[PDB]
Every structure is written in C-alpha cells, then in structure tokens.
Ligand binder design. Structure first.
Ligand SMILES: Cc1cc2c(cc1C1(c3ccc(C(=O)O)cn3)CC1)C(C)(C)CCC2(C)C
Ligand SMILES: Cc1cc2c(cc1C1(c3ccc(C(=O)O)cn3)CC1)C(C)(C)CCC2(C)C
Ligand SMILES: Cc1cc2c(cc1C1(c3ccc(C(=O)O)cn3)CC1)C(C)(C)CCC2(C)C
Ligand SMILES: Cc1cc2c(cc1C1(c3ccc(C(=O)O)cn3)CC1)C(C)(C)CCC2(C)C
Ligand SMILES: Cc1cc2c(cc1C1(c3ccc(C(=O)O)cn3)CC1)C(C)(C)CCC2(C)C
Ligand SMILES: Cc1cc2c(cc1C1(c3ccc(C(=O)O)cn3)CC1)C(C)(C)CCC2(C)C
Ligand SMILES: Cc1cc2c(cc1C1(c3ccc(C(=O)O)cn3)CC1)C(C)(C)CCC2(C)C
Ligand SMILES: Cc1cc2c(cc1C1(c3ccc(C(=O)O)cn3)CC1)C(C)(C)CCC2(C)C
Ligand SMILES: [Cl-]
Ligand SMILES: [Cl-]
Ligand SMILES: [Cl-]
Ligand SMILES: [Cl-]
Ligand code: NI
Ligand code: NI
Ligand code: NI
Ligand code: NI
Ligand code: NI
Ligand code: NI
Ligand code: NI
Ligand code: NI
Lengths: 201, 201, 201, 201, 201, 201, 201, 201
C-alpha cells in the first residue's frame, strides 16, 4: 500500500445540479478504484460489492475536501457552487449543515491533504462489512495496510501532531451517518421528482 | 457507423440476485459505451447524461437477449437463472412476464443476432430526448447513423425478410415501458428492503 | 392496408379542460378505430382490448400533432389552448414539456403529415403486446402491414429523405413513456380531486 | 319519449374478469345512448358530459338486471359468472353484497322488465346534476318526459300495482351509492394493480 | 301515514361551526323520529339501525331546505350562515356547491314545502336497505305508505303539477351521494383535527 | 345534588357487535343526561357540548361496570358477550385488556355500586374542560356538587373505607386514556370498513 | 409518606427549545423519583417501568405549575418562554391551549402550592396501571398513602376549602389526555424533523 | 483521562423485551457518564446534549460486548437472550445480523476487553458533532485525550498488535450506521405498537 500510488489515483480524477455532479463522479469511479494498489486483484464480484457499498461515502468525501475553500458552500465536481442558502431553500438544509460542520470545516481546520483524503477513501473502499464479499478477511487485510501506511505518513509529515492519525479516522463515522442520510433524501427526491408533488415544493 | 465496431463492443463484455446481476453489468457499462463509434467524442457531460437515461433499457436488452435459450426464465449476467416461478413468488411476476413475452420470446422467434442487438442498444444510447444534452441534434445525428447501418445490415443478411428492420425498431417501445416499470419496482424494494416490512413478504 | 383509407379515418374526426378534451375524443374513438382497414374483423373482445391498451397514446399523438402551430402550447380537441405556463402552474409542467419537446416540436420540424400520423396511430392500435388478445399473431400481422404501407408512402412522397420511415417509428417509444406518465398524473388528480386536498393545491 | 324506442335501445345491445366485462359494455355505450329519443339532439359537449357522469350507474343497472336468474352471483356482459364467494375472496365482498341485496334480488322480486330497466337507465342518463351541462333545464325536461312515459307504462301493464312507479324510482339512490363505492374500489385496484402489492393480496 | 302527523314532527324541531350545528341537530333527532307515525312500533334495534343509516342524509335534507332563502349559502341549525366563499376557503368547496346546486336551489325553485320535506325525510328514515334490520319487509311497507300519502298530498295541493311527486323522489339520489361525500370529508377533518396538520391547512 | 336522583337515572336505562351495542346506548344517552339534577337547566348549546365530549367515556364506564360478573369479557348493552379471545382475534386486544385490567376488574374488587358509578358518570358529564361551553364555571360548580354528595355517600355507606372516595376518582384518568384509545381504534375500523382492506384482516 | 419529604424532592430540582427543555428535565428525573419516600424500595424493574409510563405527565405537571406567572405562555425548565403565539405558529396551537386552559390557568386560580404539586406527581408516579409491574398491589398501596397524606395536608392548610382535595385529583385526567396528545405531536415532529418536509413547514 | 477510571465506570454498571432492556440501561446512563473523568465539568446543557446524541450507540456498544459469549444471539441487560431466529421472526432480522456480524463477532475475534470498550464509549460520548454544544472545541479536546490514553493502553497490553488501536476506532462507523438504523426501527414499532396494525404483524 504505497501511499504515493493512492495520491496518484486521486489526482487521476440545486438538487438537480448536485445529482448531475454525483453522476459525473460515478462515470469514472471504477477508474479511481482500479488505481488503488490491490483492488484489481480482488474477485470481480468482490469489486462491484465494495463499490456498491461505498460509492456515496466516497463521493461525499471527495466533494467535501474539494470544498475547503468555499464560503459556506460546496464545490460540485461540475464546477458550480451550492451555498448554505440554496440548500436550505431546496429542503436539504439540515444535512447540508452536517456536511459543512462535520466534514468541510473540520477537513479545513486540520488542513487535510490529498494523500490523507485518498487514504480515508481507500479505507472506506476496503470495507469488510460489505455484504456478500467472497473473502472478507482479504478485504480486512487490505484496509489495515492502508491505515498502516497512512499512520506512517502522518508520523512523517506531521511529527508535531501525534494524534492526527486517530483524528483522521474519527471522521469516518461522520461520513457513515451523513452518507445514510444522503441516500434517504435521494430516495425522497427520486420519489417526488417530476410529479405535480415536486412542483408543489 | 460501422456495425462491426458495435458487435465488437457487445462481445467485449431472486431480487437480491437480480440486483447484484445488474450491478455487475453497470461496473463495465461505461467501457461498453466507450466502444461505440463516436460516443467518446461527445462532451463528457453529454456522455454521463446519455448513460443515466439509458442504463436500464440497455441492461434490460442485454439480459433479455442473453436469455433466448432459457426455459421460461432469465439468464443473469451472473450465470444464475431466475424462472417464471421464483419471479412470481418474489412479487415481480407481472413485469417478469412482460420480459419473457415482449422481449425474450420475441427476440427468440426472430433469431435476433448480436449485431442487431448491439445496434438497438447503440440506438437507445444515442437518445436525443435525454434531458440536459448540450448538443441534441448531434446525438440525433449519431442515432440515425446507427439505424442507417442497421437497416443496411438487415437488408444484406436477411434479404428475404424486408420488414425485419422495422420489426426490430418496434421492440424499442416495449423496452421503454418495461424499463419504467423496472425502475418503479426497484424503488419499492429499495424502499422496504432491510426493514421489518421486507420480512413481511 | 391502403394508407389512404387510414388518412380518411383521421379526417373523419387547465387540468379540468384537458380531461374534458380527452373525453370528447374518447366519445368517438371507437368510430375512428372502426375505420381502420381490418380492425372490425378482429374478434370483438380483441377490439376492446386493443383500444383499452392504446387509448391514451393514441389521443396523445392526436393532440400533439394538432398542436404543431401553437406557440409553446397544446391545442385541445375542444378548441381551447393550454400554454406551457398554465401547465407548470397546474403542476403538470415536467410532462407537459416532454409533450412539446419530444412530440409536438419534433412532429413540427419533420413536417409530419396526417397520413403519417394516422399510420403511427394505426400501428399503436395494432399492438400485439396487448394483454389477453385471442389471436396475437393476427394483430402482429396487421401492424406490419401498416408500417409496410407507411414505409412505401414515405419512399414515394419523401424520396430525398430515406431515413424518415425509421425516424417516424422512433417517436413511438416517446409516446409510450409519455403515455405511462400521463396515466400516473391522471390517477393523482383523480385521487385528490374535489377533496379539500385539491383546494390546498 | 315513447317507452318503446327505449326498450329497443336496450335490446340493441374475478376483478380482472369484471373490469373486462365493464370494458366490453363501454365499447358500445355511446351506441346505446344515441338510441334514446332526444339524446342525439343535445349539444355534443352535453352528451359526453352526461355519459361521463352516468357510465357506471348505467352499467351497474344493466348487469344487475341481467343477473336476476343467477344463484347468488352476477352475470357479466362477458357470459361468465362471479359468485358471492369469489367476490369475497377477491376483497370486494361488502359491495358485492349490496349489489345482490339492493339491486339484483330486489329487481328480481318485482319482476322488473326491460322496458322499466331501460327507463331507469334513460333517467340516470338525463341527469341535470351533471357538472358543466350547457342547458341543464333542457336535460331536466328530457328526464321528466322519460319518467312520465314510465309512470304511464307502469299504470298500463301493472294496474293492480299502483305504487310500482315510485318503487322503481326508489332504486335510484341505491344505484347512486353503489356506483360511488364501485369507483372507489376501482381506484384502489387500479392503484395496486400489477405491483408487488397486488401479489400480496 | 297521515302526512299531517309528519309535518307536525318537522315543526316540533366554518367546519367547526357546521359540525356543532350537526351536533345540535343530533341532540333531538331521536325525538323527531319518535314522532313519525309507526316508527316507535318497530323493534328498538331496528330503530337504532334506521337512525344510524339515515342520520346525515336526514340532516342534510333539513339544513338544505332551511337554507332556501340564503344568498349563496347555508343556514345552520345554529342560526349562523356559511357562504360559498368560506366553504371554498375551508376546503369543502366542491361538495358545498353540490349542496346549493343539487339540493338548496332545486328545493327553492320547486317551492318545496315542509310537508313534502318531512315526507322525503320520513322516506329516507324507513330505509329497507338498512343493514341488520330484523324485519325489512316491515320497513319497506312503512315507506311505501309514506310515499303513498305523499303522492296523494302532491295531487291535492298541486294538481297543475302532475310530475311533482316523481320530481320530489328524484332528489333522493342526490341526497344519497352528497351524504356519502359528507361522511368522507368528516373523516378527513376528524383525522387531521387538532394536529399540527390542521394548523397547516 | 341528591345522589339518589342519579342512581335513578342509571336504573332508568366482535367489532360489529360492539359498535351496534354502543349505538343502542347512544340512542337513549340524552334521556339519561336529562335525568341528572341540573343538566337540563344548562344552555342547550352547553348540553350538546358536554355530551359530545363525554359520550364514549360515559359509555365505557357503563359497559365496564355492567361486565363485573363476566369471565374475562365484556357484557354489551345488547346482551351478547365478547371475550378476551375474540377481542385479540379482532385486533383490539391491547385496549380490551386495559378495559378488563384497569376498569372492570378494579370496579369488581371494590364492589363499586351503581350509585357510585352514576356519580362518576355525572362527574365526567359535567366537564368544565369541554371546549366551547358558554358558562364553564357553572359546569365546574355542578361537578363539585356531584363529588360532594359522592364523598358524603361514600362516608355513610362505607365508613370503614375512608380512602374509597379518592380511590373512585382515581379511575377517571384510566377512563380518559382508554376513551382516547377507543376513538382511535374506531377511526381505523371506520376507515378500512367495507373495503377490500377489511377483508384482509 | 410524609408530604414534607415530597416537597423537598420537588425543591431538589419553539419546538426545538421545548424538547431541549424536556431533555434537561429527564436528565435528573430519576434523581427526583429516588427522593420519593418508598420509590427506591420497589424492585429496580418496577422503578424503570413506573418512570417510563409517567415521565411526560410528570414533566407536563412540572412545567405547567412553573408557568403560573407567565402571560399566556409556558416557562421552560431552560429559563426561556414560549407564548401562545409562537406555539400556534409552530403548529402546536391546539394542545398548547389545553395546557394553559386546563393546567396552567387552573393551577393558578387554585393557587396550587408545591407540596400539592409534588403529591400529584408522586401519585402519577405510583401508577398501578403501569404495564409489567411485578407487584401492582404494592404500587397501589404507595399511591393511596400519598393521597392520604395529601388529603390531610389539604384539610390542615385549607380548612375553608373542603373540596380542594377532590378538585386537585380531578386535574389528573386532564394531565392524562394532554400527555397522550403530547407524545403524538412528539412522534410527528420526530418523524418529519431534519427532512425537507420540516423545511416545507 | 486515566483509562483506569473509565474501566471503573463500566464495571460500576423479543422487541418488548429488548426495549425494556434498553430502558433498564437508560435508568443509570447518567450515572455512568458522571463517572467519566471530566464529563461532570462540562456545562450541564452540554452534558444533556452529549447524552441525547450518544445514548443508543452507547447502549448498542454495551449490549454488543456483553454478548460475546452468546450463541448467535444477544444478551440483554435484563439477563434474557434474543437469538437470531426470534429477531428474524420479529421483523428485525437484517439489523440484528449487522449487530452480530459487525459488532458482536468482531468484538469477539479481537477479544476486545472492557477497558477498550469503555474508551470507545467514552469517545462516542465526547462527540464534538453533537448539535448545540456550548464549547465544542472543549469536547473535542476531551475525546482526543481518551483515544490518547486508549492508544497508549493498546500499546502496553498488546505490543505484538500494533494496528489494534486503529482497528478499534474502525468499529465506530459501524456503531454509527447500526445506531441510525436502530432508531428507525424504533420509530416504526412505536408507531404501530398497541394498534390493530401490530396484531397483524
Ligand atoms: C447525489 C447527492 C445528493 C445530495 C448530497 C450528496 C450527493 C452525493 C454527491 C457526491 C459528489 C458530488 C460532487 O462531486 O459534485 C455531488 N453529490 C452523492 C453523494 C448531499 C449530502 C449534499 C445532501 C444534498 C443531496 C441533494 C441529498
Ligand atoms: C436491477 C433490475 C431489477 C429487476 C429487473 C431488472 C433489473 C435490471 C437488470 C439488468 C441486467 C441484469 C443481468 O445482466 O443479469 C439483471 N437485471 C437493471 C435492469 C426486472 C425487469 C427483471 C424486474 C425484477 C427486478 C428485481 C425489479
Ligand atoms: C386526460 C389527459 C391529462 C393530461 C395529459 C393528457 C391527457 C390526454 C388527452 C387526450 C386528448 C386531448 C385533446 O384532444 O385535447 C387532451 N388530453 C388523455 C391523453 C397531458 C399529457 C397533457 C399531461 C397533463 C395531464 C393533465 C396529466
Ligand atoms: C368495473 C367494475 C368493477 C367492480 C364492480 C362493478 C364494475 C362495473 C361493471 C359494469 C358492467 C359489468 C358487466 O356487464 O359484466 C361489470 N362491472 C363498472 C360498474 C362491482 C360493483 C361489482 C364491485 C367490484 C368491482 C371489481 C370494484
Ligand atoms: C357535519 C356536517 C359537515 C359538513 C356538511 C354537512 C354536515 C351535516 C350537517 C347537517 C345539518 C346541519 C345544520 O342543521 O346546521 C349541519 N351539518 C351532518 C350532515 C356539508 C355537506 C355541508 C359539507 C361540509 C362539511 C363540513 C363536510
Ligand atoms: C363503539 C365502541 C368500540 C370499541 C370499544 C368501545 C366502544 C364503546 C361502547 C360503549 C357501550 C357499549 C355497550 O354498552 O355494549 C359498547 N361499546 C363506545 C365506547 C372498546 C373500548 C371495547 C374497544 C373495541 C372497540 C371496537 C374499538
Ligand atoms: C417534549 C415536549 C413537546 C411538546 C410539549 C411538551 C413536552 C414536554 C416538556 C417537559 C418539560 C418541559 C420544561 O421543563 O420546560 C417542556 N416540555 C415533555 C413533556 C407540549 C405539551 C408543550 C406541546 C408542544 C410539544 C412540542 C408537542
Ligand atoms: C431499543 C432497541 C431496539 C432495537 C435494537 C436495539 C435497541 C437498543 C438497546 C440497547 C441496550 C439493550 C440491552 O442492554 O439489552 C437492548 N437494546 C437501544 C439500542 C436492535 C439494534 C437490536 C434492533 C432491534 C430493535 C427492536 C429495533
Ligand atoms: Cl456562488
Ligand atoms: Cl359459476
Ligand atoms: Cl353572512
Ligand atoms: Cl435462549
Ligand atoms: Ni459561490
Ligand atoms: Ni434454469
Ligand atoms: Ni394560444
Ligand atoms: Ni355460475
Ligand atoms: Ni349571511
Ligand atoms: Ni360469556
Ligand atoms: Ni415571556
Ligand atoms: Ni439463549
């Protein structure tokens, strides 16, 4: 798990606008995955499963980081902005605030670099809890390798900050909850979309 | 639009089982699209849009054809079978019958070849009605090229059958309706999945 | 299956206003059907079935064509207009746009004539996928006759445009989807009509 | 408004089976209406409106009468039977009992003839309460003519039975309520039809 | 069934306001019933059943008649008025219009007297279709007596108007439908009452 | 407030069966109320209001007491029984158990007499919290008179039991909750009654 | 069961604001309970059960009393106010009025002291109807002790008012109903909270 | 922030059974919190907020660990067992499997000790993402202290296992998701509880 090969993979890459943005990102997510050290060696079936389970947390981590320099807002993969106001107006205010508060702003205060982001992603990607994996222990092994390199990296680049490694990992539960919330809102809009119901709201 | 280029793209590639099957197929759908003659030259944004709008009709056409030699059933991209009985038992009986009646059996009686399938796919892929396309006329142009080559092909290989070209095109509306129905059932199961409600049925 | 006999059948003939319009059209739909070449020879039971399955696509095609010269709007069978604005205000904006974009405007650019419209209708009428038909192959035969005459007609009147026949057929899937959408909205309004709920919206 | 001409109009003509039955009957309802004395002279718009408002009461009166000689059941316009048992099993037990109790059996005890049935129908057809009629007073006039001839007829053929005329009219409110109930069940089945929900039931 | 004893019984007697009004009327409905000729002789159980089945049609007939001299409105048993405007604003516009159009205005044009009203009431009261009556034939007999006296009365007081009797009876189906509608709205308001839901609307 | 006047008023008087039972009881509830000391002197409007707010608690108290000698069951005002088993089978098990546990059995252990029951009733009847009362303090005054006589009575007949008066009053909150629950179940059954949904359970 | 020990337990201690207020109060509710005379001696299991069943009535009684000197409003345990206006604006108007009318204002007119409040609380706490109590009679015994001391206290401090004891107890049913209502609204807000639905309202 | 004091706090302490179990645990949760090093020094308001946000994850971690020696099941705080079978039968199968798979079994394979459990708990308790905290940075500081001691402890007791610390933290996202799922099921059961709906299930 050379952390360098991971950083390389990263570099290698309102509701209507946000969903199209997510789309653009999904269009090349398999490409990104294929760049992570041993992902390609996992059974093809284990690969789809890992991606199916982590796609939105992954994306939520990507756009969050990319938005570190946006004034109370998010920077879509599409180039457009979405600010706290539009989000509230669109009915996705509460979760949008979680994004800024729990992910964006906190990734900004730590000055979380790409290498670190990629790792967190790589980690969420190698999720042993993914249902139906052929060999879970295998997957487990690949993630402990990632956070091993990751902890090392953090010790090298940020020796003054000894608790950064943990601190980084502690952003994963926030990505977990936000993600579940994301999918819930996604259902809703998908359910009321293009029906007179939507015109209402 | 060389029809051979298309055929090459094709060759290049119960509810829980069916969804995992669809997943496996989505994992490489972009790859398939990238093999169609001029798809890659369309703006990236127009590419995601075309795929978002045609993914399930596309997949429904693929598994339908692949199932031509299955006794009252479907042959998943996963290798497993799903027969009319399991489908009814799973609550997806009515649409499952549409698949066999309107797509599978009719693709079987015509002895619809891969070249022809790929074209129909290529056609659904180049859908000018896709919302948000930058250059729609451009997309329109690419599909009329596909069905031009397609009609030619049909004239060459099946001269005795002069109405086959139309006959082929007339399977598209069935894919349209079945597809919409598919997504509806997909919502439902996605909606009650992993909830005590699912235990109920 | 002379195309002339079909053209003669054609010639032979906001939500509250739209529904009353649809009504006026249903009042004589059987008459129109009875004018199509061999429709009357099909078992009576097969006749009701064909009409039950195609009534709204049929009507949607009729009013769409009739609206070719309306500024961003639809020309009801009642003489009244309904413009993009009223539709959005009424909550049927999204589908109304599909009508104008996918049907009206595209029928207008092609300068789709009555003879061609009638055929498309005749074709949707002879739908072999109609559930419960006694003799499906019989119905299949009648539609391939229609599109045979239709392709011929298109070759005669528009020799310069060799792809027009296909192009015409490719409007059927749009009528399929729009139609299903239509029925869905119809349920909704039928469900909240004359109830305090409708007042609230 | 001769009762004879009415009688002539009449003579002139489980849930899946019942609905197809209703369909068969709708296929020629306009024909039946066109045979009633002055219906054809009413504005075309007033004609559609009258049929839209009375179609199911009308049909419910037709099949009820037709079922006078059926053992605890209904005789569909399709020839098939539906017995109290199938109806209960299908979830339409309560209203089905109203049909037999309030309409069928009571039409059977009175030995209600076709002439009388036709009139009741003609009466429901000329409904001044129909929303949107151009000239309601005109419609009102046509119905009082019908029940005028009807009362006369009843005095002629059944002199010993002086209260029969009223007795007949008093079956109209039962047709009204049953009809509204019918449409409600119709929504429900149309709403859960061909969806996994249906399979559950 | 002396019609006089009936008239005697009659003489003997916005949503929040309307319901309290209905209440006031229910408080003495048994009293009114007890005044109808043979009602008291029917088994006590048959009496509750008749009242349970006819209470709202009865009341709807009472307030409708009482409102004959109100400008586009209803005169509650409470003395207060409710005009077409408040009703629409309250979400009960559609049914409120049926009341005025189908009942009030039509009772006004005929100059329907109390004696006639009472009879219609007495008639709805003696409803043989009431579920669970011990002796229905008995009830049937009492209603044919009422409309016998009623027809006689109409012949005496209004000899020039020979069709008035029928005309009167023909208002019963309108009371039937309006009544069912009434109960439906009643459920709704009872369902959303005193919940933040109501504050909304 | 003579307690004897009250006792005199009292003496003066599965889901389908239970509701018909409640009906029988409502048929004469006004009569019972009119027998309570000063109820008749309250404005008529205040009378309907008190009855509207207390009808089910009142009835629930009546049938509960009447059921003191029933083996795990309730004795309807109709003479029929309903036992813990039928209730559970009917879906009203939980509340039915509250009736037996909180009301019946506890009224049985205390050997709660009619005089005491009537009072509790009289008390619930004179409810100052009833919304819309003209003179609330007046109503308040009448209930404190009732429980004054009540406490006296309890001191006279049961001198050994000094806490019985309180104990009696402490059964009112149980009648309050059970009552609200009752109305809720009543909505539900009223909501799915006579619909295929009811056939379902 | 000295009333003094209870008074000492008491002394010992817009929707978003109200819920946080309730929270603050729950944070120390067990502490309060542990201060009531024999509560701690009851099986631990019986203790949780009593608190689970009475927590909101208890809290509702606490904040109501604490609000005796607030102009048409409530004084949260948080120090903040919530006035009749904010409540209506928040959709909790109806129940909020019940609080002021049935609890606050009435506790204010009686000049209900802390000792008396505590008792009422202690009483609701020792609720024998609590489902699953191991020894119910035990609990029953503890509440009759409370209202025994309470009645005594009321006789001592307020000899001129002999009906005060009853009067106090008669506030319990109002706390029962208001409480059930409270929980219902609580579900609703908990159900639509942080969802686009809450935004819309 | 000595891990010892944490360990000491820990030591210091089917759906109907599970909820009563959760209850028993809530009854003393504040006590447990008060034992964590600096929790008591945080503003009282910050204390309630932290507990409100972490109560179920906390409990879910407690019962999970406690269940390490249960054959395919959970060991309630009540002493009772709940096995995979009862859970599925109760409709909570899917989440129950997540508990065993993601928490129980994985806590069992690592041989996760109490000291480590307590820490994870202490960590979830000091959640800076808790909405409405007065001083979040303060809370953040307390959690980094906990995982600092925790990492140290893990290095001391398990020197051969260098990745255990991370491995432990990586169980937090699973607790997050499971927790959200838990609350969702909790709503559902609370919503259909004690209603005929419950009896159906
Ligand atoms: C689709 C989607 C929808 C939403 C969100 C996130 C996404 C995701 C995503 C990921 C990446 C990008 C991008 O890079 O531009 C855009 N979107 C899919 C996770 C949040 C959380 C903002 C709440 C608002 C809604 C509308 C519910
Ligand atoms: C996901 C999906 C779900 C369903 C269907 C089709 C798919 C699709 C798909 C595509 C490809 C493959 C494959 O290659 O095996 C399998 N499935 C996505 C279109 C049908 C229509 C069978 C109805 C039953 C349900 C369960 C609703
Ligand atoms: C009833 C109906 C309702 C609607 C539509 C079409 C019809 C149909 C129809 C048929 C014929 C005519 C006419 O001749 O004027 C008009 N309408 C029945 C198909 C569209 C698609 C406009 C979406 C808006 C809604 C309100 C959902
Ligand atoms: C469509 C329809 C559906 C239903 C009914 C009646 C009809 C109607 C009808 C009319 C005519 C014929 C016939 O001639 O055979 C049959 N049915 C339309 C009125 C009843 C009342 C039986 C309740 C059961 C359901 C399933 C709800
Ligand atoms: C309760 C009730 C509610 C409603 C109506 C009628 C009544 C009834 C009634 C009868 C008599 C009186 C009176 O004499 O004042 C008042 N109300 C019960 C029939 C109509 C139809 C106006 C629709 C509006 C709503 C609010 C649905
Ligand atoms: C109508 C009603 C329905 C129900 C109940 C009580 C009544 C009431 C009542 C009053 C009196 C009598 C009688 O005298 O026999 C019978 N019932 C109206 C209060 C309980 C609580 C048993 C729950 C079961 C359901 C079906 C929900
Ligand atoms: C949570 C809660 C919500 C609500 C209420 C009461 C509470 C409770 C409570 C307890 C204590 C305190 C306090 O000390 O300030 C405040 N509130 C929990 C009972 C009322 C009745 C005001 C209706 C409005 C809603 C929003 C439904
Ligand atoms: C209340 C609750 C309900 C449920 C669960 C967990 C709890 C919680 C809990 C905590 C502690 C204990 C105990 O110590 O025995 C038991 N349960 C509250 C988290 C799971 C996850 C099993 C899903 C099944 C349902 C029924 C939805
Ligand atoms: Cl911007
Ligand atoms: Cl048969
Ligand atoms: Cl006025
Ligand atoms: Cl066990
Ligand atoms: Ni910006
Ligand atoms: Ni097979
Ligand atoms: Ni115009
Ligand atoms: Ni038969
Ligand atoms: Ni007025
Ligand atoms: Ni018995
Ligand atoms: Ni204030
Ligand atoms: Ni066990």
């Amino acid at each position: 798990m050379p952390v360098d090969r991971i950083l390389e993979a990263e570099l290698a890459v309102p509701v209507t606008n946000i969903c199209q943005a997510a789309d653009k990102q999904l269009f090349t997510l398999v490409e990104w995955a294929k760049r992570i050290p041993h992902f390609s060696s996992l059974p093809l079936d284990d690969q789809v499963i890992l991606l199916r389970a982590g796609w939105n947390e992954l994306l939520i981590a990507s756009f969050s980081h990319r938005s570190i320099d946006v004034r109370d807002g998010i920077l879509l993969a599409t180039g457009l902005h979405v600010h706290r106001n539009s989000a509230h107006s669109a009915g996705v205010g509460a979760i949008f605030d979680r994004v800024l508060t729990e992910l964006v702003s906190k990734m900004r205060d730590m000055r979380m670099d790409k290498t670190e982001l990629g790792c967190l992603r790589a980690i969420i990607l190698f999720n042993p809890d993914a249902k139906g994996l052929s060999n879970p222990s295998e997957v487990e092994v690949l993630r402990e390798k990632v956070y091993a390199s990751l902890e090392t990296y953090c010790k090298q680049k940020y020796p003054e900050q000894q608790g950064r490694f943990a601190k980084l990992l502690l952003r994963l539960p926030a990505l977990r909850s936000i993600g579940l919330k994301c999918l819930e809102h996604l259902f809703f809009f998908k359910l009321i979309g293009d029906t007179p119901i939507d015109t209402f709201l």
